TrEMBL record:
<comment type="subunit">
    <text>At low DSF concentrations, interacts with RpfF.</text>
</comment>
<protein>
    <recommendedName>
        <fullName>Sensory/regulatory protein RpfC</fullName>
    </recommendedName>
</protein>
Length: 265
């Protein structure tokens, strides 16, 4: 079997990597979910509705929470327009900078989180259950590429805001234990969460009009775990392994150029 058996070993190793990495990613996303849910839960059930209008207090809460959870990039507490007197927009937010923790009220100095351009606010103010945004560049606030998990707080029929957790995309490869150039993450609809190239994430990465990519593209469309090769735009052939994230049905794809996989083995 000789090049057939080398190939079968290559795929088994790739399957192990993508499976372990889908796993890391699962625990990371569930940790962010659980924490955002816990914070919206506390605010909704226990919070003093005039301790909560206190930016020094919210800044302390959010700093300690980011400081205590190394994997989180940032967290916000964002209120419906006019929740409180003399403020339209109010959204304390803390994020990790390379040297500390920065703070801003997004609604004063960052952006109008309610204007429709912001998934993390618009989708999420009444899912109740919580919601992941698509990948975006957090311009004016976090100023990096991220996805965010947002959860409404209050009670029926109208909640009065969301709390959020941001995950910086630049960190996923390390958190997943895969070199950036070998990692793609797709959401459940197959849209790009993570790619080495940042203009790809923001709208492209696989030519499906290419005969060689058909099996890889079906694998992606069927939303199944599996192995397949493919070519990129420069015509480099990769061997790739796709693993599913349980429940969310996001995908982790591990791919390494074939020349390189054969050279090591």
């Amino acid at each position: 079997e000789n090049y057939l058996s080398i190939e079968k070993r290559l795929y088994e190793n790739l399957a192990q990597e993508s499976s372990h990495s889908a796993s890391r990613l699962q625990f990371l996303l569930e940790h962010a979910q659980a924490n955002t849910q816990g914070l919206s839960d506390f605010i909704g059930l226990l919070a003093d509705k005039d301790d909560i209008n206190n930016p020094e207090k919210l800044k302390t809460v959010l700093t300690n929470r980011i400081q205590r959870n190394p994997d989180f990039f940032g967290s916000a507490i964002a209120f419906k327009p006019n929740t409180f007197p003399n403020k339209k927009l109010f959204s304390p937010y803390v994020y990790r900078s390379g040297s500390g923790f920065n703070y801003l009220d997004i609604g004063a100095d960052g952006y109008d989180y309610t204007d429709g351009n912001w998934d993390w606010w618009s989708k999420a103010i009444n899912q109740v259950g919580g919601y992941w945004s698509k990948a975006y560049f957090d311009e004016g606030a976090g100023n990096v590429l991220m996805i965010t998990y947002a959860v409404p707080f209050g009670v029926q029929p109208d909640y009065f805001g969301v709390t959020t957790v941001d995950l910086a995309l630049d960190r996923l490869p390390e958190q997943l234990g895969i070199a950036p150039s070998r990692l793609v993450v797709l959401d459940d609809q197959g849209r790009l969460i993570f790619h080495s190239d940042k203009e790809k994430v923001l709208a492209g990465w696989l030519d499906k009009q290419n005969i060689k990519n058909i099996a890889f593209a079906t694998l992606l469309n069927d939303g199944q775990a599996g192995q397949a090769s493919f070519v990129d735009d420069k015509g480099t052939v990769y061997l790739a392994s796709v693993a599913e994230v349980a429940k969310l049905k996001w995908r982790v794809v591990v791919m390494v150029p074939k020349h390189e996989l054969f050279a090591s083995l």
